[PDB]
Scaffold this active site. Structure first.
Site, PDB file in Angstrom:
ATOM      1  N   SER A  24      12.147  38.790  24.892  1.00  0.00           N
ATOM      2  CA  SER A  24      13.164  37.859  24.373  1.00  0.00           C
ATOM      3  C   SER A  24      13.177  36.603  25.264  1.00  0.00           C
ATOM      4  O   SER A  24      12.132  35.904  25.262  1.00  0.00           O
ATOM      5  CB  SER A  24      14.465  38.542  24.206  1.00  0.00           C
ATOM      6  OG  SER A  24      15.251  37.758  23.317  1.00  0.00           O
TER       7      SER A  24
ATOM      8  N   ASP B  65      14.954  42.923  11.275  1.00  0.00           N
ATOM      9  CA  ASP B  65      15.999  42.553  12.271  1.00  0.00           C
ATOM     10  C   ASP B  65      15.508  41.309  13.025  1.00  0.00           C
ATOM     11  O   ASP B  65      14.375  40.878  12.720  1.00  0.00           O
ATOM     12  CB  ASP B  65      16.271  43.754  13.180  1.00  0.00           C
ATOM     13  CG  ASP B  65      16.939  43.396  14.493  1.00  0.00           C
ATOM     14  OD1 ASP B  65      17.844  42.539  14.465  1.00  0.00           O
ATOM     15  OD2 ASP B  65      16.546  43.973  15.529  1.00  0.00           O
TER      16      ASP B  65
ATOM     17  N   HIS C 195      16.513  51.432  12.102  1.00  0.00           N
ATOM     18  CA  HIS C 195      16.420  52.114  13.423  1.00  0.00           C
ATOM     19  C   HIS C 195      16.701  53.618  13.272  1.00  0.00           C
ATOM     20  O   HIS C 195      16.705  54.098  12.119  1.00  0.00           O
ATOM     21  CB  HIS C 195      17.372  51.409  14.405  1.00  0.00           C
ATOM     22  CG  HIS C 195      17.045  49.968  14.639  1.00  0.00           C
ATOM     23  ND1 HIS C 195      17.640  48.943  13.921  1.00  0.00           N
ATOM     24  CD2 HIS C 195      16.196  49.375  15.510  1.00  0.00           C
ATOM     25  CE1 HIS C 195      17.170  47.784  14.341  1.00  0.00           C
ATOM     26  NE2 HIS C 195      16.282  48.023  15.315  1.00  0.00           N
TER      27      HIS C 195
END
Length: 677
Positions: free
Chosen positions: A532, A617, A652
């Site tokens: 990230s 996502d 998930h």
């Protein structure tokens, strides 16, 4: 051998401050996520990754099996007591989800099931328990559950007397709720039905139609997160409003009917504060007088009446505190160490909690009852699996409650060090590293250097079971505590963000160069990983110092920085001007563009790299890593491995997906180990 996928080039000009940037892959962004050309490129890259890594299947199986073999199938939490009941969380092998149980405090033998995640997940595609809390009177259970995977929580209520559920559901909540002291009223946070940011506080009577719920507060600035808390005293429910820089708290009387929010201190840019209430005083952690925070006591909201308990100090960051009958306990950072200190309310006696390890972390753990001399605190180190301790604040008796179980593990096989690196501007950068003693030979071991370096998040030194798969194959594993992290407090953060962000990348390079110069590893086998904002780190460092690293893993990397930060239709962008800056201002456009990894890809040799993203996502949207790989394939001059792995899963598993999390780690570690051979 194999020809990699080649994304179609569609020149898309972006002109800001008169500067035209031409983005050939702008079209890989499809917010609707249905463009067949976009899915063809992601799928093509997945097939190429599959094809290129096929010889590593046996190694991936070996790594997966040895990682799962360290972990205990049977996990039971440490029991805690709250309002006269004892609570335990239980994982059974061949149960997908935890079971939450409890018993009266005076009971030993029998446990009652509160909620069985396996029963709740029956006939559903997805299940995440967002949180759980029994009412003050022990009669009702509130639960926040997500059945859809969108992090939008439904809140439901169970009558514990007969295990019946009430008829209502509170929908599209943040999962943040608090019980009033009547055990009949709950406050909860509703998300914006478009942006999904938390923005309204409602009051609900349990059992009733949620159409009757009362709107207590609405936040007008969507850079402010809306959370709920309850004070140690139980006297107030707090509406906790905060941006990256600025706080405001409103108080709700938890005992009386028809409470309306009572202002504490009105928001003021760069004033961050948080409160609790206990012993008829407000306790306030505030940076009003210094960036490293102080602790104050007050009888009233009025900031001018706040008494100093702990002044802000240049050498010590105040992170948090807990309140007990006879003691204040604070969690602090100083000289690159986390520390706990206790101060007696009456005597002013100060004690420090002693450890003996060069590379550890300590923190306040869960302490739900203040009328006690027993403090629960956590400990972890690069060599010592995570431990929960109970300390008698009066007698100093320290007892272990639970240790992380690690099979096939001998702790004395490993060594750790703290190293300080003088960076190119003369600032001292701390480093934490761990290796296996019997395979260490100076200048010969591969290095894995891990960094994050944003948001004042610290990469605190702590134990990792999966990490043993690298250490037991001769790796020296390094945490680089680079600026933009929080390891040396608020100023360490501020010297690695906005017009100082380049320090994060310089520090990562300076640490890596120092550890090679000092003989910790093989100059030819240096590897790095970040995810990230740590992926931004990876992307900037390979553009700037491409020859330093053999191979890189960049997870969900933030790399299209200028283009993303110019577009408020992208999530995170409106809330991240106080991290990277706002490139609508020429000063920030220029400063960010200089490191924006997508923009600074050049026709040069790069390291081997594995890049990961997710379609369905996102925290970084899937297109940034896909565009980055497309541009690297077009421009890079080397013949090294470049792979994009896009998670196609529609959602998930058990709290994240444990099987899947180990499969992802095995794929990344096999990629790195194959390069190191």
């Amino acid at each position: 051998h194999m020809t990699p996928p080649k994304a179609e080039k569609r020149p898309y000009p972006i002109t800001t401050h008169g500067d035209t940037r031409v983005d050939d892959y702008y079209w890989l962004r499809d917010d609707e996520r249905t463009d067949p050309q976009v899915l063809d490129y992601l799928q093509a890259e997945n097939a190429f990754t599959d094809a290129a890594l096929k010889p590593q299947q046996a190694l991936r199986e070996t790594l997966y099996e040895e990682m799962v073999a360290r972990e205990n199938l049977y996990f039971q939490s440490v029991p805690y007591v709250r309002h006269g009941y004892r609570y335990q969380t239980r994982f059974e092998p061949g149960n997908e989800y935890a079971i939450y149980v409890r018993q009266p405090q005076a009971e030993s033998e029998h446990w009652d099931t509160l909620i069985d995640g396996n029963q709740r997940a029956e006939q559903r595609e997805f299940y995440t328990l967002g949180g759980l809390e029994v009412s003050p009177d022990n009669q009702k259970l509130a639960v926040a559950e997500d059945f859809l995977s969108r992090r939008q929580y439904d809140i439901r209520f169970k009558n514990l007397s007969d295990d019946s559920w009430t008829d209502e559901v509170l929908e599209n909540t943040s999962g943040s709720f608090e019980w009033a002291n009547d055990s009949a009223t709950v406050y909860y946070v509703r998300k914006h039905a478009k942006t999904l940011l938390p923005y309204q506080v409602y009051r609900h009577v349990v059992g009733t139609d949620p159409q009757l719920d009362e709107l207590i507060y609405e936040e007008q600035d969507d850079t402010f997160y809306v959370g709920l808390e309850k004070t140690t005293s139980d006297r107030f429910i707090l509406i906790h409003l905060s941006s990256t820089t600025t706080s405001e708290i409103l108080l709700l009387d938890a005992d009386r009917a028809d409470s309306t929010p009572q202002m504490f201190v009105p928001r003021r840019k760069d004033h961050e504060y948080g409160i609790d209430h206990y012993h008829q005083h407000f306790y306030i952690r505030s940076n009003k007088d210094g960036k490293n925070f102080g602790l104050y006591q007050s009888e009233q909201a009025d900031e001018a009446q706040w008494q100093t308990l702990i002044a802000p100090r240049i050498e010590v960051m105040l992170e948090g505190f807990s309140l007990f009958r006879d003691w204040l306990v604070v969690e602090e950072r100083s000289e690159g160490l986390t520390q706990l200190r206790q101060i007696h309310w009456q005597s002013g006696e100060v004690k420090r909690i002693a450890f003996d390890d060069p590379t550890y972390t300590t923190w306040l753990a869960y302490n739900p009852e203040p009328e006690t001399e027993l403090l629960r605190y956590g400990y972890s180190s690069m060599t010592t699996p995570t431990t929960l301790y109970e300390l008698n604040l009066d007698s100093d008796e320290r007892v272990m409650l639970k240790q992380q179980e690690v099979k096939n593990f001998t702790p004395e096989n490993y060594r750790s060090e703290r190293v300080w690196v003088k960076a190119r501007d003369g600032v001292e950068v701390p480093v934490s590293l761990v290796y296996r003693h019997d395979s260490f030979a100076r200048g010969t071991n591969p290095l894995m250097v891990y960094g994050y370096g944003s948001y004042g998040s610290s990469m605190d030194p702590a134990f990792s079971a999966s990490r043993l798969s690298l250490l037991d194959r001769g790796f020296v594993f390094v945490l680089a505590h680079i600026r933009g992290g929080g390891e040396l407090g608020q100023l360490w953060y501020e010297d690695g963000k906005l017009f100082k962000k380049q320090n994060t990348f310089n520090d990562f390079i300076d640490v890596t160069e120092a550890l090679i110069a000092q003989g910790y590893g093989d100059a030819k086998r240096v590897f790095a990983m970040g995810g990230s904002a740590g992926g931004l780190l990876m992307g900037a460092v390979i553009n700037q110092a491409p020859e330093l690293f053999n191979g890189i893993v960049a997870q969900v990397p933030f790399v299209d920085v200028v283009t993303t930060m110019l577009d408020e239709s992208i999530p995170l962008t409106t809330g991240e001007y106080d991290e990277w800056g706002n490139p609508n201002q020429q000063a920030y456009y220029d400063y960010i563009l200089q490191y924006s990894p997508y923009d600074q890809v050049k026709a040069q040799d790069y390291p081997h790299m594995l890049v990961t993203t997710g379609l369905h996502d996102s925290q970084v949207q899937y297109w940034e890593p896909a565009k980055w790989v497309a541009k690297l394939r077009e421009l890079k001059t080397d013949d090294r491995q470049l792979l994009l792995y896009t998670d196609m899963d529609s959602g998930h598993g058990g709290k994240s997906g444990r099987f899947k999390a180990y499969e992802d780690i095995a794929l990344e570690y096999a990629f790195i180990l194959a390069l190191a051979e």
